[PDB]
Amino acid sequence: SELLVNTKSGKVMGTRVPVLSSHISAFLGIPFAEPPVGNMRFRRPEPKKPWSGVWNASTYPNNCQQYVDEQFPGFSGSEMWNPNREMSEDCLYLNIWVPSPRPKSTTVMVWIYGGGFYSGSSTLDVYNGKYLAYTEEVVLVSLSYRVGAFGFLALHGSQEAPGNVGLLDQRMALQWVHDNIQFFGGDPKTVTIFGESAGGASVGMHILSPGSRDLFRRAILQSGSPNCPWASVSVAEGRRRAVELGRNLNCNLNSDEELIHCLREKKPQELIDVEWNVLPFDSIFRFSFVPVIDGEFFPTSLESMLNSGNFKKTQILLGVNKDEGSFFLLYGAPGFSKDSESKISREDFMSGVKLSVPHANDLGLDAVTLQYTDWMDDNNGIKNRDGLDDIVGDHNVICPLMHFVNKYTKFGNGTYLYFFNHRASNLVWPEWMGVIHGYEIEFVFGLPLVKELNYTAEEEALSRRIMHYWATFAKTGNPNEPHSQESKWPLFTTKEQKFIDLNTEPMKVHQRLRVQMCVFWNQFLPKLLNAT
Amino acid sequence: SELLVNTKSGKVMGTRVPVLSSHISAFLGIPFAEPPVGNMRFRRPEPKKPWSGVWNASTYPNNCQQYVDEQFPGFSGSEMWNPNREMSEDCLYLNIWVPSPRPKSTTVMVWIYGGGFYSGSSTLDVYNGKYLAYTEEVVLVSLSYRVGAFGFLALHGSQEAPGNVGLLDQRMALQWVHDNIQFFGGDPKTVTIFGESAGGASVGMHILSPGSRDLFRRAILQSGSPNCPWASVSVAEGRRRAVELGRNLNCNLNSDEELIHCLREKKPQELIDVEWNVLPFDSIFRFSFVPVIDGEFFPTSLESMLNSGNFKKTQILLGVNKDEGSFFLLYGAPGFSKDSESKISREDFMSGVKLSVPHANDLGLDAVTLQYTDWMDDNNGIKNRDGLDDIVGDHNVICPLMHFVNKYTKFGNGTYLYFFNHRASNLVWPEWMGVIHGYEIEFVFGLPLVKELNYTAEEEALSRRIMHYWATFAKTGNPNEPHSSKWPLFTTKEQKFIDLNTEPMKVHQRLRVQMCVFWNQFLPKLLNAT
Ligand SMILES: COc1cc(CNC(=O)Cc2cn(CCNc3c4ccccc4nc4cc(Cl)ccc34)nn2)ccc1O
Ligand SMILES: COc1cc(CNC(=O)Cc2cn(CCNc3c4ccccc4nc4cc(Cl)ccc34)nn2)ccc1O
Ligand SMILES: *[C@@H]1O[C@H](CO)[C@@H](O)[C@H](O)[C@H]1NC(C)=O
Ligand SMILES: *[C@@H]1O[C@H](CO)[C@@H](O)[C@H](O)[C@H]1NC(C)=O
Ligand SMILES: *[C@@H]1O[C@H](CO)[C@@H](O)[C@H](O)[C@H]1NC(C)=O
Ligand SMILES: *[C@@H]1O[C@H](CO)[C@@H](O)[C@H](O)[C@H]1NC(C)=O
Ligand SMILES: *[C@@H]1O[C@H](CO)[C@@H](O)[C@H](O)[C@H]1NC(C)=O
Ligand SMILES: *[C@@H]1O[C@H](CO)[C@@H](O)[C@H](O)[C@H]1NC(C)=O
Ligand SMILES: [Cl-]
Ligand SMILES: [Cl-]
Ligand SMILES: [Cl-]
Ligand SMILES: [Cl-]
Ligand SMILES: [Cl-]
């Protein structure tokens, strides 16, 4: 039976799903861990105990408990990122799309969703794996992991709330794929992990973490890298935020045990309602409960691991979007609105700079301002708007990724870098937001192939070449088919630093992605902030 | 009669000189101070005592004692700035060119030479006042002042070597003009002082100093301003350099009196031979003996005077050249040569910014480097060279002047700002040096009007335009003649300036505003913080 699969934890029964006038098999909502509920809240995950009978894997699972965005009620542009299933702490499930007929031993791709480590679901429409699995003949897995305080409350020293347990959730799903994907026609020796934003940082963190390295072959990182300023905190700061969470909930704070015991008695929504109150500053692109540099999942500082070559040496493919910052300014900074051009006054520019670089002293804010201000034309609201957009995306996404790219390439086995800069013809968000954080995902997952969604024919072709780059890289470590007639995406090298644009035009090769601003963010500003 | 003038100090006899197929009167080498020689070395100047008989004013005077540039022997481009008369400590003289026939009561312009406060002569070819006096019908005076240690050795608290005596030489010549120019056909109520480089800084210093302000009407500043980083030192640093000069010469250092007595025994060239040894850093565009912020000539810090409005409120006309830095790199920085395009390696670029900003810490040098480096093309030797050129000129001339112009305009009565960016067609220096520090002077003084010097016809028209702007401003406080395109007032809000070149005038705003925010606001804050 094509839909009946016996795994090491028991039998599962999938469902036959239509795709683009054909069909493939889907195994939805397979458990990979014990429910992390009750006295297991904040604890490392435990493997799912084997079950008798047949697991009905015909429907999507629950989503993990998380903040729900109600900024634009009814608006598809925001609501499509919210949970579309019931939320529950019982949420550690994965989904598998398998070509039909079942392949013998084919390439596997495992998707890790983003969402700032505080939101995200495996079940969103834009993460539907059926188009990529069918078009490129890959076995596509999407995992899940605890987000927010449930996944990343860190009281270092405690074994009840150690921190990083959402990362351990991801690892346990990777271990399940390693142990079971052969029963679905996948090769556990050819697993590519890919993810976007926090999922892209996560992918980088598994490259670094010794306990993860042997559970995958190579990696794709989209608009995120492990060294991003929002993607981790120190053990001291994670302790600070966890204690502040208890303080917001009238918890006994005398010891880790009773603080944890207090927090385990609260309903999930009680923690979520105060989650944002524990941040140290008014800020944008900052999130309360994130991975912690603990000495276990990460043996030393990320920078020292990067400098020494202490990471998995393989092939990577990674990149960024042109306007990573716009969504964060819309939600968090003065003068921005989705129903206007959002021309930014000089006063609102100054406010946004402080929100964008909250850890900076006054000298550091001056440096950022001078670097991004045209003093011949300082009251230009369009230049002010775009300058802030660039500040947010450069500081938080692009320049951290370029730092990772350059350190990794010194030891890795092949780097391919992209710059996604296509604005979708059917975008529901205003034109000033440009090429938004997250809006390459629908191209990676082949949604433009669905004629009902009203993408252009050029956008379908773009989606198809991106899916084929991604999958060919997954299968071989090279996005290019050698001996093909197509334009070749060149290796990124330390010396020449090449990358391509991804858009609907013929390929352009460039060098030194945003090198000028990234010298500022990666070398000058940190030296300034460390001055005294 | 026309050439025989009785002044308050005695009779002077000038000479009839040819100018452009005509003639005017020249009175050369008139003394305005007692010779500051012997025990008067380093002291404030004293008025020249009256003489009987007729002072022969037919010949240029001696030049003050100074370092002589021998980098390019026989090269006219460097030797034209060196002394062209015998050097002597007996050098406090001035020169006057008077239209013929003698006007009744006309506008006076007084030239103050530059040269880093360590060199300069009133007698150079490019300062010949006859073309400007004749063409614009003004009385043209050039003064002189002691340079180097002789003018600016500063041992504050001593009255024997107090500092700033070179500035007091300038003021005494202005006092002499105030008292006597009426006998030469000049109006002492309509005196414009103007100078370039250190002379431009000097002009600004006389605007600030209460003891100078009543001795002139208006001012012109060319490629220099009083707040320039090279233009003054603190009394502590001045004292340190004076003590180090004595140390270099095996002087007794126990007391001011003993040090000064030692330094007064040395021959002039003995002091000049060690002058540069007292600088605290390897550097370019830094000079050993310069004005001191003493509490007397300058009542408080320059910045506080500028902020409070404690200065002379009048009209000013001022500006800069496109490539102020190139001359200093040629003489002082690795990789530059007069005989090549001087493409600058990355290594020599780093050495250059260190020499250019000697007071900066490592973080400050990084900031300057980031501000001027194209990291898409960092091994471009042309971009590295031009970046270093901009650094030197922006830091040392352009941005200090813009800080001055913005502060002055808040209280003053009229500001006119120019940007001189014409490369002379007969320039003797290589192309990479561009529009060099000092090379607007020949246009201000009308040398393009001289056929044998082989300027183009367009360059003669430019010089005539510049001479008329300068003199009309001197006469009225406004460079424009009330009838025709206008040079607009620089205002705090609109910040307009004009280019000066052979092309029709264009108005711009915010001269090098991006780099001057860096030099005037961010870098000072960075260095004060780190
Ligand atoms: C600043 O401090 C505080 C902050 C808050 C509240 N902040 C906020 O909600 C910011 C926010 C976060 N998301 C997450 C929604 N999904 C996503 C995306 C998810 C994953 C990956 C890419 C995504 N790309 C999106 C692009 C657009 Cl265009 C819209 C939504 C996107 N939506 N908005 C409350 C209180 C505070 O004190
Ligand atoms: C910090 O200490 C140091 C500082 C420096 C940096 N100062 C120096 O270059 C000064 C200098 C002066 N002359 C001889 C002066 N004639 C002049 C000028 C005179 C007055 C006004 C403008 C002049 N425009 C000239 C242009 C050219 Cl092209 C050639 C000579 C010019 N030659 N050099 C170098 C080394 C150091 O150690
Ligand atoms: C599995 O669940 C699906 C979805 O409701 C249902 O249609 C199907 O009958 C179930 N299979 C069983 C009960 O064997
Ligand atoms: C990857 O490693 C193999 C094995 O040593 C080597 O032959 C190849 O050159 C490497 N490729 C890159 C791009 O480093
Ligand atoms: C897609 O375009 C069709 C044809 O114009 C239109 O009827 C439909 O409403 C569009 N669908 C969406 C989801 O925009
Ligand atoms: C003034 O000096 C010049 C040369 O030094 C001389 O020719 C002239 O006759 C002198 N005038 C006198 C001595 O009256
Ligand atoms: C100069 O001062 C006069 C007299 O007070 C005044 O009328 C005029 O506005 C001033 N001009 C400028 C440019 O400030
Ligand atoms: C000026 O031009 C004349 C005439 O062509 C020429 O003889 C002379 O050499 C030139 N002078 C200089 C100083 O170049
Ligand atoms: Cl479909
Ligand atoms: Cl390489
Ligand atoms: Cl002549
Ligand atoms: Cl040039
Ligand atoms: Cl004004």
Residue numbers in the entry:
A (entry chain B): 4 to 535
B (entry chain A): 4 to 487, 490 to 535
What does the paper say about this structure?
In the crystal structure of TcAChE complexed with the 6-chlorotacrine-based triazole derivative 16, the 6-chlorotacrine moiety binds as previously observed, with the conjugated system π-stacked to Trp84, and the Cl atom fitting into the hydrophobic groove comprising Phe330, Tyr334, Trp432, Met437, and Ile439. Along the linker, the triazole ring is engaged in two perpendicular π-stacking interactions with Tyr334 and Phe300, and in H-bonds with Tyr121 and Asp72. From this point onwards, the observed conformations of the phenolic moiety of 16 differ in the two TcAChE monomers of the asymmetric unit. In monomer A, the phenolic moiety makes a π-stacking interaction with Trp279 in the PAS. In monomer B, the ether oxygen of the phenolic moiety H-bonds to the main carbonyl of Arg289. In general, these structural changes lead to decreased AChE and BChE inhibitory activities relative to the parent compounds, with the exception of the triazole-containing compound 16, which is a more potent AChE and BChE inhibitor than the parent 6-chlorotacrine, likely as a result of multi-site binding within the active-site gorge of the enzyme, as confirmed by the crystal structure of its complex with TcAChE. In this context, the huprine and triazole derivatives 6, 10 and 16 are those with the most potent and selective hAChE inhibitory activity, with IC50 values of 59.2 nM, 200 nM and 7.18 nM, respectively, and selectivities for hAChE over hBChE inhibition of 55, 16, and 40, respectively. Most important, these compounds are 23-, 7- and 192-fold more potent and 37-, 11- and 27-fold more selective hAChE inhibitors than pyridostigmine, the most widely used drug for treatment of myasthenia gravis and other myasthenic syndromes.
Diagnostic testing and symptomatic treatment of myasthenia gravis are based on restoration of cholinergic transmission at the neuromuscular junction by means of peripherally-acting inhibitors of acetylcholinesterase (AChE), the enzyme responsible for the hydrolysis of the neurotransmitter acetylcholine at the synapse. In this study, we explored two different approaches to accessing more polar derivatives of tacrine, 6-chlorotacrine, and huprine Y, which may serve as new peripherally-acting AChEIs of potential value for treatment of myasthenia gravis. Furthermore, the three-dimensional structures of complexes of several of these compounds with Torpedo californica AChE (TcAChE) were also solved, in order to shed light on their mechanism of action.
